[PDB]
């Protein structure tokens, strides 16, 4: 999609694991999505396996971590998302496509474009925006700001 009227927007989120957009609104967006799927079925088993996957999100809402140092063992509160889970490769890719869709809707109050592609891989992504007029040196410094 590369041309002289488009630009690519790759952003490097520094601490993806423990940001504020990952603790409460990410675990409550999955729990709310498993309650619209408990009204779409009629078996007694499919309601149960959608209730147990919901139960792993309420328990990880307030999770403590254990780090040993010296003699003492520290217990630190950590309600965020780390790796080593099972869903962390397919649910981190949903939280990016919902966060970069909200940022590209707030930047469209200053410019007028048409998003060609968005592609997410964990926490490194890009998005190709196609503009009306030709891309200049001022439309690159003021989109990045």
């Amino acid at each position: 999609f590369l041309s002289n009227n488009s630009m690519v927007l790759y952003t490097d989120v520094s601490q993806w694991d423990s940001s504020q957009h990952n603790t409460q609104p990410f675990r409550k967006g999955i729990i709310m999505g498993l309650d619209m799927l408990a009204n779409m079925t009629n078996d007694a088993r499919v309601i149960q396996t959608l209730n147990l996957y919901k139960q792993t999100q309420i328990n990880l809402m307030d999770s403590y971590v254990q780090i040993p140092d010296g003699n003492v063992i520290k217990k630190i509160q950590y309600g965020a998302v780390a790796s080593g889970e099972k869903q962390t490769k397919a649910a981190n890719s949903i939280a990016n496509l919902a966060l970069i869709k909200t940022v590209l809707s707030r930047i469209s109050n200053k410019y007028s474009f048409a998003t060609k592609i968005i592609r997410v891989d964990g926490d490194d992504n890009y998005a190709v925006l196609q503009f009306n007029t030709e891309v200049t040196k001022q439309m690159v410094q003021d989109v990045s700001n």
Partner: protein
Amino acid sequence: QYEILQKTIPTFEPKESILKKLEDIKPEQVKKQTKLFRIFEPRQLPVYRANGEKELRNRWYWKLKRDTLPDGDYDVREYFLNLYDQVLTEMPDYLLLKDMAVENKNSRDAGKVVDSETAAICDAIFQDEETEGVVRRFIAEMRQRVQADRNVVNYPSILHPIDHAFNEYFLQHQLVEPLNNDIIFNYIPERIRNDVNYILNMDRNLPSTARYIRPNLLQDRLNLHDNFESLWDTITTSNYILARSVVPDLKELVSTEAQIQKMSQDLQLEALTIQSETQFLTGINSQAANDCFKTLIAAMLSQRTMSLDFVTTNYMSLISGMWLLTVVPNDMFIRESLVACQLAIINTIIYPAFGMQRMHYRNGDPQTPFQIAEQQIQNFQVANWLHFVNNNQFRQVVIDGVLNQVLNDNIRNGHVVNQLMEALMQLSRQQFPTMPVDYKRSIQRGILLLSNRLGQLVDLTRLLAYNYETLMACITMNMQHVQTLTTEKLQLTSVTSLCMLIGNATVIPSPQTLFHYYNVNVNFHSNYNERINDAVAIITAANRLNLYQKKMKSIVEDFLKRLQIFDISRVPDDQMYRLRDRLRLLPVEIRRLDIFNLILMNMEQIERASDKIAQGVIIAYRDMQLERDEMYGYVNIARNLDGFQQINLEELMRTGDYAQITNMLLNNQPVALVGALPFITDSSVISLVAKLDATVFAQIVKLRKVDTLKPILYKINSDSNDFYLVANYDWVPTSTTKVYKQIPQQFDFRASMHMLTSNLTFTVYSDLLAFVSADTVEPINAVAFDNMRIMNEL
């Protein structure tokens, strides 16, 4: 050892509601009352004679129970909208009067009165010191009269005439009807009790005492299929997951290892070459037949728009696609996916088989490719089938009050397959020149596997048209036919798994499923109609009471909340203010209207006969004698406001224009302020002689507010201080300003009693279909609408 290190995390409560399926919406509780609706109570006040002195006796008067009436004229009309909401929940469905019956302690013979509050008033007046001999003799002859032939009772009462107009209305208009064993057998729909296959039986015959509450099944008055394309999409999806769980599954299919082995020899599939006949067997098993039979019946009972799904290189999925379009009406599949399936039949099965050039179909043409190819084709047997597909439509007839959409009489017979299997039996005989010989073999082989099952496929069309016409009889809400937003996808591979895996075994829906599908369509259609009438009655009653400052977003939000299937927080304020433009034009139910005209007629008597409020001051600047009353002694009360200009305070508190009431206070002109206005009370003659009542009006000029207005209401009696000025010197007390105020009505015992009449005993039954216990005739003898049975052919 452990060291705890905790931090803050900000909370985040998303706006969510609790959604339920249609299978579990419980009916509401039957409202009954346990005490009478009282809004007035008696009270013992002292009495004063004409001079101003205090007499030895007392007197009873009516006063309000909990007179919490607010100041300001707009907050009184807001209070009577809240009182009208309290009566609509307090009103009972049935009222058995013998449950509220307290023994009368003083009587000729020990009878009963109607309430605990009724026997408290009778006891205090009887034991009173100053009571007269006539009223005390009247409480002795106060008992009930029981008639046992017609089961009625007459319990005595003591109520205000506004109280009597509310409790007499609750006894005359009850929601109970008598119940026999003929009203149970008419609760079942007419197509099921007149069915041959179901034998209906019951055990106990109910008495003549037994009553029941009838639901209101009248069709929807909002027209939610008309320009509400997001509230209709989630009211017909929730109607589809219910009808998916009711349509039965198939028993005794053809054994799959004995059918696919016969099928794989007729295709004669070679183990070496890539041909188009190895794809004729992909995806045929027992599970794909039980999920295509359900999604055909359950979509028709809910009017979901289906959507076909297929692959063009599978020719057997295109001959099974010739069977849906000649049975299911084409006004049900979505047009961007019905046309792309009709085009694949034409360019592969029909137009190559006749030797003509394949058609060039452009996007968005107004004619479907079957509607073009009946003009261009020249055969007769394949242009007669092709005319039924273009004119296959639902027939909207109204049976038993419910407009439901009926299939054609040829699909319901099975005679439509004898038009199909004579059309694709001539298309197999037409040799065709423009294609290679290995293409003629692959169409002629796959058209033979369907034309060998013609005995067991007429019998399939009679099963779809019978398991859909029986489950049609169990709905009550009006089924309408519009294109929905989201589509329920049907897979065309799983239609091949139904046409050639069925045989010789009828499945018929058991009556324990029919009596459950019927009892959750009544519980939703009745709940849909008791939330309209609870919401039209507040929208109309807020436009009659002139509430120009209230917005009806909140009371349409409450109407969507009680219907358990809609989520509120994703419905905007555009689709909720357009809804109360349809809830306004409806006429309100006759029980909510008569209980509102009883409030609107005497909403000025409940307001006037209370303390902590007054209806505005009159100002005279002229020395006027204040009137004498028996309960107040001497009091400055003006009973009627005439002869004076009026400056109402609600118009002065809305516009804020204080140019007139300032220029009328400075020039000393007589004026009469009008509005709900709180007052204070004093009792001293020195606060009258020193004229402390014309002082409180000078705050409207210095400030601008009128909310802190507190007039004076004098009260000069014998127990007041400095009364000897009134008795010694010959003067009536003369004031300047007086209060617009009314005098509470005297309480007379012999004229305020009543005789409440109601029944002795009911027995209210809620579930009616727990008495009948139906059973189905053996499914090998199952009789269709014509008396020849379904699933008969070998």
